[PDB]
Amino acid sequence: QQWVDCEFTGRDFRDEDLSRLHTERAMFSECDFSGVNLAESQHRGSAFRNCTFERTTLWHSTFAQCSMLGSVFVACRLRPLTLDDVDFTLAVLGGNDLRGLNLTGCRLRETSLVDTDLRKCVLRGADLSGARTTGARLDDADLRGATVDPVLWRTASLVGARVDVDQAVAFAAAHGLCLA
Amino acid sequence: QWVDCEFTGRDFRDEDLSRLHTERAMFSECDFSGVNLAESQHRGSAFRNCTFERTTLWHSTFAQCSMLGSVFVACRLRPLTLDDVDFTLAVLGGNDLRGLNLTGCRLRETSLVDTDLRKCVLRGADLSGARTTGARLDDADLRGATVDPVLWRTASLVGARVDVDQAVAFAAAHGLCLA
Predict the structure, then answer these.
(1) CATH number reported for the structural domain that contains residue B11 in this entry
(2) Which of A162, A172, A180 faces B177 most closely, judged by CB atoms?
(3) Which run of H or of E encompasses B152?
(4) Contact present, B114 and B134 (Cβ < 8 Å)
(5) Which ranges form a coiled coil (chain A) (predicted)?
(6) How many structural domains are present in chain B?
(7) Interchain CB distance below 8 Å, B176 and A161
(8) Which residue range(s) make up the domain with A171?
(9) How many beta-carbon pairs below 8 A join chains A and B?
(10) d(Cα B154, Cα A120) in Å, to the nearest integer?
């Protein structure tokens, strides 16, 4: 299947098998994709705004120039998959396993990453301004050039996380050191 | 006044030696516990493996001097002038050194467990190997000092002033990888 320029608000897609679905500029707003099989699906320029994804399988899928603004993901199969310029602004990703995903240059402004496993992820140039990172795991992740708040440095687990020089400094300041 | 003098295993206990001025005097394994060295002066002298328990040292001046391996216990050390002094392997745990100027001093493998160094000036000092568990370095000036990764993980450092290289080092001491 292939859906182009569709706009749905409040739709119930629960338990559906949407594997290999292709969407192009689809707008899904406040839709429920819980229990859905979205494996090997392809989306381009579509939006999943304030949607519900509980126990949804997104394995091997591809999202290019998509927005997931404000959507909530609970215990979903989110890896591996291809994200190519996707906006997660205000999404709730808490508790999921996102290990090793390439989130290069993605927007994760005010995203909730509480208890989220982002180990070995590539977050180069990503934007984490305002994200909630209590319990988040960033060990071995690459944060080079990412925009991050002083609080991430105090919250996220960061052993082996790769950082640039301004970031190492912000980390020291975030722990109370006075750069004199 | 002890000039170019050398003592060993001597007990100076409870003696009043205030305003003493030593020069090139060297003490080895001597005991100054309870001694009064108030407003004393010393230049080029060494105090090797000596015992300083409850010694009074306030207002003395120590210039170009060594305290190698000496043990300090609950000493009156403030105020004090310590100009290029070597505390290598000395034991300072539990002492109060708040605000002292320790610029350029050596504290290599010095034991500072629970030692109060707040607002101390430690610019250029060498702290390599110091034992810093419980050491308080809050608001102390550490710029240009040589410090090991473990100090970054054990001393309290709120407000401590550091340069870029030390900040980077603090981050690596916690597991961040600079790439």
Answers:
(1) 2.160.20.80
(2) A162
(3) helix B149-154
(4) yes
(5) none
(6) 1
(7) yes
(8) 1-180
(9) 77
(10) 28
